[PDB]
Design an enzyme around this catalytic site. Structure first.
Site, PDB file in Angstrom:
ATOM      1  N   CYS A   1      23.413  98.290  41.644  1.00  0.00           N
ATOM      2  CA  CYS A   1      23.767  97.126  40.784  1.00  0.00           C
ATOM      3  C   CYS A   1      24.993  97.487  39.936  1.00  0.00           C
ATOM      4  O   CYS A   1      25.375  98.635  39.841  1.00  0.00           O
ATOM      5  CB  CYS A   1      22.572  96.790  39.882  1.00  0.00           C
ATOM      6  SG  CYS A   1      23.106  95.793  38.467  1.00  0.00           S
TER       7      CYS A   1
ATOM      8  N   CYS B   1      23.942  96.778  35.665  1.00  0.00           N
ATOM      9  CA  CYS B   1      22.822  97.709  35.349  1.00  0.00           C
ATOM     10  C   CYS B   1      23.381  99.121  35.155  1.00  0.00           C
ATOM     11  O   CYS B   1      23.168  99.751  34.138  1.00  0.00           O
ATOM     12  CB  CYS B   1      21.814  97.703  36.502  1.00  0.00           C
ATOM     13  SG  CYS B   1      21.616  96.013  37.119  1.00  0.00           S
TER      14      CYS B   1
END
Length: 105
Positions: free
Chosen positions: A32, A35
């Site tokens: 991600c 993230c």
């Protein structure tokens, strides 16, 4: 220091190898973007607090630890000690890591 957990095997040996030192685990998606964007903070304390053990588990490579950990909401920071979860909190609050780390310090 830091230790990449590739499987539940390193997970258990990592907690017992930690001894009685603090052990904060960070569950995030390395694949991600937004993230892994919180890595210059959690994984950064490695240079500020050399007396803290930070574990980096990838919910994509070590899906075994993510499944047993029941982590269905990343990013998530758990606090383990002697191999016992003694604190945890989910949320992109990198500032909270300090207040919490100073808890079982």
């Amino acid at each position: 220091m830091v230790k990449q957990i590739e499987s539940k095997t390193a997970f258990q040996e990592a907690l017992d190898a930690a001894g009685d030192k603090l052990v904060v685990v960070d569950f995030s998606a390395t694949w991600c973007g937004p993230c892994k964007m919180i890595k210059p903070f959690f994984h950064s304390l490695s240079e500020k607090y050399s007396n803290v053990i930070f574990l980096e588990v990838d919910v994509d490579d070590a899906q075994d630890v993510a499944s047993e950990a029941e982590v269905k909401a990343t990013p998530t920071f758990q606090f383990f000690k002697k191999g016992q979860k003694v604190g945890e909190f989910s949320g992109a609050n990198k500032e909270k890591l300090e207040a919490t780390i100073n808890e079982l310090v």
